[PDB]
Structure formats: structure tokens, C-alpha cells
Amino acid sequence: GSLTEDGLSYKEKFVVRSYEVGSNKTATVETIANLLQEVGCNHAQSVGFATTTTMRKLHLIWVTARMHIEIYKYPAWGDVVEIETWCQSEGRIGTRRDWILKDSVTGEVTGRATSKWVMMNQDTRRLQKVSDDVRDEYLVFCPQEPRLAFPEENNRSLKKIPKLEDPAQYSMIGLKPRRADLDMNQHVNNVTYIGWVLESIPQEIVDTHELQVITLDYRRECQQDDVVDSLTTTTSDSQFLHLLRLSGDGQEINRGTTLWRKK
Template sequence: MLKVSCNVTDQIHVLSQCRFLPPSAPLFSSFRRRNAATLCASLTRPPVVAALVSDKGEPCVQSGSGSLADRLRLGTLVEDGLSYKEKFIVRCYEVGINKTATVETIANLLQEVGCNHAQGVGFSTDGFATTPTMRKLHLIWVTARMHIEIYKYPAWGDVVEIETWCQGEGRIGTRRDWILKDYATGQVIGRATSKWVMMNQDTRRLQKVSDDVRDEYLVHCPRDLRLAFPEENNSSLKKIPKLEDPGHYSRLGLMPRRADLDMNQHVNNVTYIGWVLEVSILVPISLEFLKYYTGQE
């Protein structure tokens, strides 16, 4: 009898290997093949879940095969289709000198799970969570403000589960929240919230969210206010006081590189976090984006 002992990370690795194994490839021996097949069967993920809008304008969840990326991704919409969860393994290139994930890694994962959520409900085919109306009018979402708090940094090889959802934020934008958990223990290790505004990609001017756009994305948002940070009146998204000039920490001469630009053709918000961390080490971090750079300024 073949006995296998593994942790959560090992299970995810084994699952991915089982999926890529050609049917004709021998697996150790005929005896071991039967046991390995049993192991893979026990780790099989639930079917891909997609969010659709019913004829009544209400969200519904439907199982299906999805794209290849959907089948390999360790994420899915929750049962009501109004939030999305995904699991990530912390890779060796995502940790710092202390073998724990960096703030930039966390911010990149937040952005990734947000984009995957948007793809799961049919958006973001050629931009960050853009709806059909937005793509038609050359409109994009840009980060106006972000607040991240990490209570425990995941280490190399840890599995992190991130849940995200979005909500309306007045007429000028939308809000996206995240909760991060250690998948092995279920412990909340971080929270984040952000405010996004709509910008015309051609003129680079902010634009109010139209009723058409609101109707397209609000159907996938929770009906009741749901906050990653429990207190409704907390300071997580309040305007940051104007800094004195010069600031206590500063660095001059920064020039955006080509690699700093994202698909919206401006410096990605995660890059700004990296610049900040070059002059200061932070645990909670709040950012307010006053101007976006395209690398040509």
C-alpha cells in the first residue's frame, strides 16, 4: 500500500502535476499508478464557476468548463456570484531576504485576484475590469486611493487565499475590498481596500460613471455594504492630509522604466509602492494617487 503524507502546498503541486500528465506516460509502476490515480481523484477541484446575469437582471452562478486559464486557476466565484476567492502559493521570487512575501508581492496578488474576478463575470478582456460600454468609449479604471494592512506576512511556500468584491462608490468611482487568509489555518493575515475612478484613455481626464456602466457592474456587487475593514467610518479610505514640502522621507530623480508601465500605458500602482519602500519601511500603507505617469513626462 502506498501511503502519501503532504501539506496544503504539496497537494496543490501534486494536483497540477496530475493534470499535465499524458495518459500514455507510465507512473512508477502499475501498482503505484492505481494509488496515484486515487490521490489525484481525491484532490480534483470543483468545476469552473461563472457568473451570469439572468433575464430578470439578477446574478446567477453556472458551472462549466471555462477557458484553459480558468481550469488551471485556483479560484472561483462564491455561490452567490458576488465575490471571488483564489488561492496562491508564495513563490521564491516573491519573497525578500527574510523569506516572507514583500508588500509589492501582496499588492500584485490583490491586483491579480481583482482582474481574475472581473474576468469571471465577463469583463476585462482587454483592460483592468473594463465593461463593454467602457471599452466602447475608451474608458479605464485607475486607482485613486488604496489602503493595505498586513498582520502576518506569508512565507515562501505558504498558500494564501484572497477574497475580493467590488461596490459602487458614488458617481465618481467604485470600491474594491480584499481579505487575505492563511489557507492552512483560516487566519486572517491582511485586509485591503481601494477606490477606483474612471478615466478616458485618450484624453487622460477623469469622467463620471454613467448609468450604463453602473448597471453593468453593480449587478455583480453585494447589495448591502460590505467592508474589509469592519468599521464603516474607519480612516482606511479617508483623504490623506497634504504633506509638508519637503516631506520627511523623499527621493528625487525617479524615472519610470518601460517595465513599470502596465496595459493601461501608465505606471502601475504597485510600482509606486516599490518607490515608497525604497525610502521607508511600512506595515500599514495608504496611498493617494494624484497624478499618473506614462514614462514620457
């Protein structure tokens, strides 16, 4: 991988592995999400950066508020996929990281993703607006003119997601993270929540449809000793409304939507 010529974005190639694919012999959406996260980590490393600056002194970190992914073609086992990523400031609201997925052989865009990140104190878990002096520290690594993976005026990445009402049509209860679900800081990896959401989709939908779009909001994290219930209701192509909540008190951890195309 490497930064591009202007130093304002980063590209990296990946060969799809045997254990990274589903029953269609193409990369799962969780494998895609892991690759997006890996290229984001490599971009931050390449420019000297969690992706923290003088935020370390104040115990501040970037945390994901929303992840949105659209896949047109899932790469096959053994295929090479090229991913380009970049960041942009969204004023004092937070930051945005965008990605473009391409087939290396054809050069065709096979997917796109966007994510919204907010600044939070790692100890109190209190959010805060991005101040001047921290904004300037990473503005030199971002394009100044807007560059959006989802430009379309009125698009799926900015839709408001409603809260699923009980009773849910489908559910998968008692979900728990194991050590492989944790990152280097012992926190549950953001991609595990995508897996948990998908667990309540019936197997017949997975066997006859392909996931085209997933939008996921992150409200609160699941701790290593917490247990999660995954809830889904059809709202329709097939569309679903999703809700992840703690098994005990019913505390919301995530809400989302998925759109699936018939194969």
C-alpha cells in the same frame, strides 16, 4: 481560482515564490499588491469583462484614486495564501474593490485591503460621474447589501492625507521606471508607485520594523520618460507622511502615509 457559490465574489490561492520575499523570508508588500491586482483581473475575466463594459464605445476606463492595505502577518516563502475579492458601487462617485487575505492552513485573516476607482476618459484624462446604464451593467456582479473589508466607523482607509511640506526628512531622487515596471498597455503599474514611496524609508526602519498599514492616493501618472523624487517625513509604532513628485517641475503624482510596528 473561482467565483464563490453566489457568484458575487472571487477566491484564489497563491504559493509564495522565492523571488517574491524580502530579508525576513516573507512576501513583500509589493508582492501582496501584485497578488491583489491579479485576483482582481481574474474576477473581471470570470464575469465577462481594463474592467470595461459598453465603456469601450465611449473610451472610458476605471483608474485607481486610492489604495489602502493592512497586513497582520506576511505569508512566508512556500506558504499558501487565499485571497477573496469583491466590488461595490459607490453611487456616481465610482467603484470600490475590497480584498481579504487568509492563511490557507489556519483560515485566519492575515490582511485586508480596499481601493477606490473613478471613471475617466482614457484620451482626455477627464473624470466623470458614473451614469445610469453603465451602473446597471456591473451591479448584477456586486453584493446589494453593504460588504466592507474596513467596516469600523472612523477607520484608517478614509483619512484625509495632507501634503508634505519642504524640506523632507528623508528622500530618494531620480527614480525611473524600466520595462518590467510597465503593464500590457505600456503604462506604469500601480504597484511600482508603492515601491517608489517605500524607497525613501531608511534601511534601519525596514530592518527593525514591519509595515502594518499603507494608504496611497493617486493624483497623476508617471509616464515612461518621467523621473520621480520620493519624499518622507516621520510624523510620530512609527508613522510617516509620503510624497512622490516629478523631478523637474515638482508636479505631485502621489501622496501617502505608512504605519510600522517594531518587530
